[PDB]
């Protein structure tokens, strides 16, 4: 599914991401925009042989199992395919564990490089929340 901006903001809020670990909704939406362009089916292969999955580009080395990433720890206890579903619940659950892991949203390099310190409130402009 390719979410609209406000549609994804509403879904994230409904799944308890708004201000999770102190990160406002706009941070999450901005991160999704630059990780996946709001496309739940996005997949991308990393240089280390792992792959990133879903709206927030969660990896298969630490977080989910894809069966082809040696050293996989699967800390989210989820097949990586679950992170491609139209329903964002599995991605949100796993992202909550990621953002709690010590470095906050710096876990997402695109967040650090494109969202951190910017006017992230713009991502929720006009939305009926
Ligand atoms: Cl915000
Ligand atoms: Cl933090
Ligand atoms: Yb990646
Ligand atoms: Yb559902
Ligand atoms: Yb409200």
PDB file of C-alpha atoms and ligand atoms in Angstrom:
ATOM      1  CA  UNK A   1       0.000   0.000   0.000  1.00  0.00           C
ATOM      2  CA  UNK A   2       1.182   3.543  -0.777  1.00  0.00           C
ATOM      3  CA  UNK A   3      -0.142   5.728   2.023  1.00  0.00           C
ATOM      4  CA  UNK A   4      -1.018   9.362   1.709  1.00  0.00           C
ATOM      5  CA  UNK A   5       0.779  11.671   4.076  1.00  0.00           C
ATOM      6  CA  UNK A   6      -2.149  12.436   6.359  1.00  0.00           C
ATOM      7  CA  UNK A   7      -3.446   8.865   6.078  1.00  0.00           C
ATOM      8  CA  UNK A   8      -0.134   7.553   7.362  1.00  0.00           C
ATOM      9  CA  UNK A   9       0.009  10.194  10.099  1.00  0.00           C
ATOM     10  CA  UNK A  10      -3.438   9.063  11.248  1.00  0.00           C
ATOM     11  CA  UNK A  11      -2.407   5.380  11.186  1.00  0.00           C
ATOM     12  CA  UNK A  12       0.780   6.076  13.140  1.00  0.00           C
ATOM     13  CA  UNK A  13      -1.184   7.988  15.769  1.00  0.00           C
ATOM     14  CA  UNK A  14      -3.761   5.184  15.998  1.00  0.00           C
ATOM     15  CA  UNK A  15      -0.856   2.754  16.677  1.00  0.00           C
ATOM     16  CA  UNK A  16       0.653   4.928  19.430  1.00  0.00           C
ATOM     17  CA  UNK A  17       3.659   6.391  17.659  1.00  0.00           C
ATOM     18  CA  UNK A  18       2.766  10.013  18.299  1.00  0.00           C
ATOM     19  CA  UNK A  19       5.334  11.197  20.844  1.00  0.00           C
ATOM     20  CA  UNK A  20       6.644   7.668  21.391  1.00  0.00           C
ATOM     21  CA  UNK A  21      10.050   7.974  23.148  1.00  0.00           C
ATOM     22  CA  UNK A  22       9.518  11.745  22.837  1.00  0.00           C
ATOM     23  CA  UNK A  23       9.421  11.774  19.023  1.00  0.00           C
ATOM     24  CA  UNK A  24       6.530  13.802  17.646  1.00  0.00           C
ATOM     25  CA  UNK A  25       4.336  12.440  14.876  1.00  0.00           C
ATOM     26  CA  UNK A  26       6.014  14.566  12.203  1.00  0.00           C
ATOM     27  CA  UNK A  27       9.357  12.862  12.934  1.00  0.00           C
ATOM     28  CA  UNK A  28       7.829   9.468  12.161  1.00  0.00           C
ATOM     29  CA  UNK A  29       6.108  10.663   9.023  1.00  0.00           C
ATOM     30  CA  UNK A  30       9.281  12.352   7.770  1.00  0.00           C
ATOM     31  CA  UNK A  31      11.253   9.185   8.462  1.00  0.00           C
ATOM     32  CA  UNK A  32       8.741   7.105   6.501  1.00  0.00           C
ATOM     33  CA  UNK A  33       8.775   9.533   3.620  1.00  0.00           C
ATOM     34  CA  UNK A  34      12.520   9.245   3.109  1.00  0.00           C
ATOM     35  CA  UNK A  35      12.834   5.529   4.006  1.00  0.00           C
ATOM     36  CA  UNK A  36      10.016   4.234   1.778  1.00  0.00           C
ATOM     37  CA  UNK A  37       8.103   7.084   0.139  1.00  0.00           C
ATOM     38  CA  UNK A  38       5.164   5.830   2.255  1.00  0.00           C
ATOM     39  CA  UNK A  39       5.170   2.444   0.382  1.00  0.00           C
ATOM     40  CA  UNK A  40       4.626  -0.519   2.736  1.00  0.00           C
ATOM     41  CA  UNK A  41       6.056  -2.918   0.111  1.00  0.00           C
ATOM     42  CA  UNK A  42       9.473  -1.230  -0.170  1.00  0.00           C
ATOM     43  CA  UNK A  43      12.475  -3.510   0.080  1.00  0.00           C
ATOM     44  CA  UNK A  44      16.169  -2.601  -0.358  1.00  0.00           C
ATOM     45  CA  UNK A  45      19.347  -4.687  -0.136  1.00  0.00           C
ATOM     46  CA  UNK A  46      22.145  -3.313   2.079  1.00  0.00           C
ATOM     47  CA  UNK A  47      25.829  -3.715   1.378  1.00  0.00           C
ATOM     48  CA  UNK A  48      26.333  -6.069   4.318  1.00  0.00           C
ATOM     49  CA  UNK A  49      23.932  -8.593   2.666  1.00  0.00           C
ATOM     50  CA  UNK A  50      20.958  -7.730   4.907  1.00  0.00           C
ATOM     51  CA  UNK A  51      17.747  -6.199   3.534  1.00  0.00           C
ATOM     52  CA  UNK A  52      15.456  -3.428   4.721  1.00  0.00           C
ATOM     53  CA  UNK A  53      11.698  -3.866   4.761  1.00  0.00           C
ATOM     54  CA  UNK A  54       8.580  -1.708   4.813  1.00  0.00           C
ATOM     55  CA  UNK A  55       7.579   1.862   5.585  1.00  0.00           C
ATOM     56  CA  UNK A  56      10.464   2.311   7.987  1.00  0.00           C
ATOM     57  CA  UNK A  57      13.036   0.134   6.243  1.00  0.00           C
ATOM     58  CA  UNK A  58      13.632  -2.287   9.139  1.00  0.00           C
ATOM     59  CA  UNK A  59      16.594  -4.600   8.722  1.00  0.00           C
ATOM     60  CA  UNK A  60      16.981  -8.336   8.617  1.00  0.00           C
ATOM     61  CA  UNK A  61      20.250  -8.543  10.527  1.00  0.00           C
ATOM     62  CA  UNK A  62      18.903  -7.295  13.804  1.00  0.00           C
ATOM     63  CA  UNK A  63      15.184  -7.004  13.662  1.00  0.00           C
ATOM     64  CA  UNK A  64      13.286  -9.417  11.448  1.00  0.00           C
ATOM     65  CA  UNK A  65      13.889 -12.866   9.865  1.00  0.00           C
ATOM     66  CA  UNK A  66      14.241 -13.150   6.081  1.00  0.00           C
ATOM     67  CA  UNK A  67      15.976 -16.518   5.991  1.00  0.00           C
ATOM     68  CA  UNK A  68      18.961 -15.192   3.981  1.00  0.00           C
ATOM     69  CA  UNK A  69      20.852 -12.943   6.400  1.00  0.00           C
ATOM     70  CA  UNK A  70      23.579 -14.794   8.311  1.00  0.00           C
ATOM     71  CA  UNK A  71      23.731 -13.716  11.921  1.00  0.00           C
ATOM     72  CA  UNK A  72      20.071 -12.753  12.017  1.00  0.00           C
ATOM     73  CA  UNK A  73      18.925 -12.062  15.583  1.00  0.00           C
ATOM     74  CA  UNK A  74      15.237 -11.387  14.802  1.00  0.00           C
ATOM     75  CA  UNK A  75      14.764  -9.151  17.884  1.00  0.00           C
ATOM     76  CA  UNK A  76      11.265  -8.206  16.728  1.00  0.00           C
ATOM     77  CA  UNK A  77      10.339 -11.919  16.398  1.00  0.00           C
ATOM     78  CA  UNK A  78       8.675 -11.389  13.046  1.00  0.00           C
ATOM     79  CA  UNK A  79       9.202 -12.626   9.462  1.00  0.00           C
ATOM     80  CA  UNK A  80      10.430  -9.613   7.478  1.00  0.00           C
ATOM     81  CA  UNK A  81       7.483 -10.171   5.049  1.00  0.00           C
ATOM     82  CA  UNK A  82       5.182  -9.019   7.899  1.00  0.00           C
ATOM     83  CA  UNK A  83       6.714  -5.601   7.646  1.00  0.00           C
ATOM     84  CA  UNK A  84       5.372  -5.262   4.023  1.00  0.00           C
ATOM     85  CA  UNK A  85       1.697  -5.582   4.918  1.00  0.00           C
ATOM     86  CA  UNK A  86      -0.869  -2.919   4.220  1.00  0.00           C
ATOM     87  CA  UNK A  87      -1.601  -2.880   7.990  1.00  0.00           C
ATOM     88  CA  UNK A  88       1.304  -1.088   9.692  1.00  0.00           C
ATOM     89  CA  UNK A  89       0.996  -2.749  13.127  1.00  0.00           C
ATOM     90  CA  UNK A  90       4.041  -5.058  12.782  1.00  0.00           C
ATOM     91  CA  UNK A  91       6.221  -2.216  11.516  1.00  0.00           C
ATOM     92  CA  UNK A  92       5.114   0.056  14.292  1.00  0.00           C
ATOM     93  CA  UNK A  93       5.677  -2.582  16.996  1.00  0.00           C
ATOM     94  CA  UNK A  94       9.180  -3.222  15.712  1.00  0.00           C
ATOM     95  CA  UNK A  95       9.974   0.481  15.294  1.00  0.00           C
ATOM     96  CA  UNK A  96       9.057   1.024  18.964  1.00  0.00           C
ATOM     97  CA  UNK A  97      11.712  -1.533  19.946  1.00  0.00           C
ATOM     98  CA  UNK A  98      14.264   0.063  17.571  1.00  0.00           C
ATOM     99  CA  UNK A  99      13.775   3.598  18.847  1.00  0.00           C
ATOM    100  CA  UNK A 100      14.076   2.309  22.405  1.00  0.00           C
ATOM    101  CA  UNK A 101      17.471   0.683  21.709  1.00  0.00           C
ATOM    102  CA  UNK A 102      19.642   3.642  22.926  1.00  0.00           C
ATOM    103  CA  UNK A 103      20.190   6.002  19.957  1.00  0.00           C
ATOM    104  CA  UNK A 104      16.585   7.056  19.466  1.00  0.00           C
ATOM    105  CA  UNK A 105      15.684   7.891  15.887  1.00  0.00           C
ATOM    106  CA  UNK A 106      19.354   8.035  14.828  1.00  0.00           C
ATOM    107  CA  UNK A 107      18.780   4.332  14.140  1.00  0.00           C
ATOM    108  CA  UNK A 108      17.334   5.542  10.839  1.00  0.00           C
ATOM    109  CA  UNK A 109      20.226   7.140   8.985  1.00  0.00           C
ATOM    110  CA  UNK A 110      17.746   8.938   6.627  1.00  0.00           C
ATOM    111  CA  UNK A 111      16.028  10.441   9.682  1.00  0.00           C
ATOM    112  CA  UNK A 112      19.335  11.711  10.982  1.00  0.00           C
ATOM    113  CA  UNK A 113      20.385  13.101   7.565  1.00  0.00           C
ATOM    114  CA  UNK A 114      17.021  14.489   6.270  1.00  0.00           C
ATOM    115  CA  UNK A 115      14.610  14.971   9.206  1.00  0.00           C
ATOM    116  CA  UNK A 116      16.565  15.641  12.414  1.00  0.00           C
ATOM    117  CA  UNK A 117      16.446  19.284  13.356  1.00  0.00           C
ATOM    118  CA  UNK A 118      14.082  20.299  10.509  1.00  0.00           C
ATOM    119  CA  UNK A 119      10.512  21.632  10.724  1.00  0.00           C
ATOM    120  CA  UNK A 120       9.024  18.175  11.025  1.00  0.00           C
ATOM    121  CA  UNK A 121       5.611  19.629  11.998  1.00  0.00           C
ATOM    122  CA  UNK A 122       5.190  20.381   8.278  1.00  0.00           C
ATOM    123  CA  UNK A 123       4.615  16.629   7.716  1.00  0.00           C
ATOM    124  CA  UNK A 124       1.368  16.748   9.649  1.00  0.00           C
ATOM    125  CA  UNK A 125       0.073  20.072   8.154  1.00  0.00           C
ATOM    126  CA  UNK A 126      -3.584  20.077   7.279  1.00  0.00           C
ATOM    127  CA  UNK A 127      -4.176  16.641   8.780  1.00  0.00           C
ATOM    128  CA  UNK A 128      -7.322  16.042  10.806  1.00  0.00           C
ATOM    129  CA  UNK A 129      -5.813  14.518  13.969  1.00  0.00           C
TER     130      UNK A 129
HETATM  131 CL1  LIG B   1       5.381  17.067  14.597  1.00  0.00          CL
HETATM  132 CL1  LIG B   2      16.064  10.212  22.192  1.00  0.00          CL
HETATM  133 YB1  LIG B   3      18.826   0.686   3.995  1.00  0.00          YB
HETATM  134 YB1  LIG B   4      -6.140  -5.017  10.374  1.00  0.00          YB
HETATM  135 YB1  LIG B   5      -6.903  15.259  18.486  1.00  0.00          YB
END
